[PDB]
Write a protein that binds this DNA or RNA. Structure first.
Lengths: 90, 59
RNA sequence: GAGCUGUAAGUAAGCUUUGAUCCAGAGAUUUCCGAAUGGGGAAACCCAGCAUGAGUUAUGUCAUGUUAUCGAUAUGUGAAUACAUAGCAUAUCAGAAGGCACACCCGGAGAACUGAAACAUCUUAGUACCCGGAGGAAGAGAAAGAAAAUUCGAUUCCCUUAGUAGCGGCGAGCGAAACGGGAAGAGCCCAAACCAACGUUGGGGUUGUAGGACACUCUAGUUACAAAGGACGACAUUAGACGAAUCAUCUGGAAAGAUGAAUCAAAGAAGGUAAUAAUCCUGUAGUCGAAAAUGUUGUCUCUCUUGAGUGGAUCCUGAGUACGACGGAGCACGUGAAAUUCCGUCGGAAUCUGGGAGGACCAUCUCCUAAGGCUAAAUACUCUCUAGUGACCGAUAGUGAACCAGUACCGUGAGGGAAAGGUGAAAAGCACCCCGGAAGGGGAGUGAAAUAGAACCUGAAACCGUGUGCU
RNA sequence: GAGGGUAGCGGAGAAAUUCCAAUCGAACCUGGAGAUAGCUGGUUCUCUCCGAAAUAGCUUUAGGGCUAGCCUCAAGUGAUGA
RNA sequence: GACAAUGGUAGGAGAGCGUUCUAAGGGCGUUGAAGCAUGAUCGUAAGGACAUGUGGAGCGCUUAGAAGUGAGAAUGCCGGUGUGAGUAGCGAAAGACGGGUGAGAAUCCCGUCCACCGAUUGACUAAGGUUUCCAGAGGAAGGCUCGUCCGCUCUGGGUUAGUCGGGUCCUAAGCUGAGGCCGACAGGCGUAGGCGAUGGAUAACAGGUUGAUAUUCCUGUACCACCUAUAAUCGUAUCG
RNA sequence: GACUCGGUGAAAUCAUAGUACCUGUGAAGAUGCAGGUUACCCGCGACAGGACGGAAAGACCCCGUGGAGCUUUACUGUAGCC
């Protein structure tokens, strides 16, 4: 759904409308870690990042650099991901 | 576990009544006799009712 | 198609695009007890024989197969006792055993409390309990029937007849059938007369408008009964994949809310997202997809197969059977004027001019053909598998059990049987400073909130303490 | 002392209605079963109008019933009431 | 307007309040819902509003429908908390002092004195219990007081057999029984044969050692059964 | 043992309680009613006249067309025996 090492835009939360890069994926709990957002403070005292819901992020279009949805069209024998509102392959 | 070998007679169950119509359980038994009959193997002694011995049976 | 080694943390050491982990179909391994089956036994243990093999100069030791009982089939099989037959030793057998849903069905045996305002006939009740046999359904089933019309035509189940006719210390009370309207709906095979062998196996034959043997000119495989084994392509389950549509400002920790402007809809069912979302995510409407296993179905294979009526010399059509008496039972019907049908004892018939029934019995009419055997459907029930619903409960409620509950615990034993749910959106679960031996507390810090600090959402009353105005 | 036997419509008793798991004129557990009780106890919000009886008869009846007397609501006849 | 009536047990009749759910219509709510607390408010009654604190996500209003619809009593059921009350009791009994440990000592360790049993409060072992046994740490709960201690908590350890008791030996009383007998079913009894010690048969003693084992480990000296290769003597042996 | 101090620390009972006496009254024997007479507020150790004092829904007597055990020339049956 949202693979690691992608470029996403946050649409809901404290750090909304801020682009980042996905660094970790937890599909059991449906949580995605985005770089640079949702900073946490743990008394051990260090500053690190926390997890955000996968439903609060949308992938960035390669051309317009705007949020969009995901689709599939079977260009080759395998399966590839495309973007709605356009035809560019992600 | 006693029964007629030729026909299959067996005891039954019923009521015993009095003049005042009080009822108690009783049994009607078959008139079985221990008689030797012809068998394919050894001639053995089996329970055969007196009714079966009528009409002509071996002994 | 990218993460994974369960709850469960946490630390190590690892695997994975050369396809980890996961879903589905198909295979292999599967300790010991338990019907337990080599013998024994206080289940989860002990002790052997026989045949091979592994190690020891040799015993000791170990591994792999087999050895229970009963029953059914071939062989050898003195007895006492001449031939034989009881006992015996072998060979074979997807032969039997035990459990299961305390639901449905058919048999054997069979109470009491209670009602009658006492009680014995009666009722409770052929109910509860016990035993036996099965099946996915079981039981019944092809007129010796119902009746009185210018008739019908196997069985089963629903409505009505009807609380009627009846039964009853005529008290309490018990209580039908036929007709009529519907669901479902096919009927056949054996014994005898007769025909050729050596009592046997084949053919023939199955009935009431009377059928058949005998003599007469005499032609639809139904594997759910009707006779029993196999080969031919289409749907349905057991994993899934595509699948339309939204952006701003205000409050706020967070927007899905409000104010404004757009879009989709064979998709406005539902769940989750930091708050109440048709257009954020998983989905829904619609369509597509199957290696392999398992069901149903239909077009050819394959396996059986004698189709019609007039005449009736003679012969055949179920015997200790029908029926009667005595003592019981069951029919709604308590022996009563009790027909119709079952059991025990004793007597005991006839052979189409025959026999049975039409509620004692006789006569006349009408209907039918017992004493042999099978048969799907409509009907009843839910331990389970998939998909759904409710003017049903919301932690003293709902299953006894929302937590690892038939658990704790109580009893020698059968048996009885609980209490216990909630931090926050995110563990971000208080670094650091001060009082101790520690528990605890005061600051600082995380968080919107810490009197949300894990004995954690709100937080009533009983009850226990501190200070104050009047007395 | 140890190993065993006799089981409730039954056992054992030098005999007391004595004992059979702290219980015995008939043990304990589970079912029929929510047995029966003409007998005690209990029965949850608020207002307005009307308002008794503790008597006769019968009764296997006497602290229980049934009919009649007395209370309440509705529809009818119309001086029949004190 | 004018008049008349309005005490009440059993019981009869009528109009109403409040709670939970459903249909339709119309509303409120993070600028704060239900719930909880207070107030000097409203109606003829059951009852209805408003404001302020806490609370953090749902809830009223109108007309109809339905019912697990209203609590002070049943020696009622379950949970919590009082009075008796700082009251009764703290389960046979002789302790005193010095030194240590420690935050804290009448109650814990070490030493001295005194005291009690001694046909037993001493030493073994059968049944039964099942880790309560040893060492090092700890003080929430258990100990009828305290506790630095423990049969209590945490972490690690401890049981060694040819000769001892049981089986590869034997049978009492009883139990189970191939065939067999009896019995509505289920099953009862019983022959050959087995199971079954509290009995019979059967080869080892002494000393030392650890915090925990001792006819078991070690040292010294024995015994019983079985197997293997030459041998004295033996082919009428010898075994049964 | 009880009594004082230190440590620990229950129970039966309980409608709410600021709980006097005499003569009367009363469902006929009053801390709570009438009249009068006594009595400043709060503790501790003792005794037992009352609170018809506390445990036990009176086993004595009676009632129920309630139970159970026993007896006989009560009634109706029956296991066995002739």
């Amino acid at each position: 759904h949202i693979k690691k090492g992608d470029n996403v835009k946050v649409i809901a939360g404290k750090d909304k409308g801020k682009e980042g890069k996905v660094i970790a994926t937890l599909p059991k709990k449906d949580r995605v870690v985005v770089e640079g957002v949702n900073i946490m403070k743990k008394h051990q005292i260090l500053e690190t990042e926390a997890a955000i819901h996968v439903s609060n992020v949308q992938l960035l279009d390669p051309k317009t650099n705007e949020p969009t949805r995901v689709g599939y069209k079977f260009v080759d024998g395998k399966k590839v991901r495309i973007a709605k509102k356009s035809g560019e392959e992600i | 576990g006693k029964q007629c070998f030729v026909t299959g007679r067996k005891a039954s169950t019923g009521n015993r009544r009095s003049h005042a119509l009080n009822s108690t359980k009783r049994r009607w038994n078959a008139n079985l006799q221990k008689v030797r009959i012809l068998v394919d193997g050894k001639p053995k002694k089996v329970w055969v009712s007196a009714r079966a011995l009528k009409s002509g049976k071996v002994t």
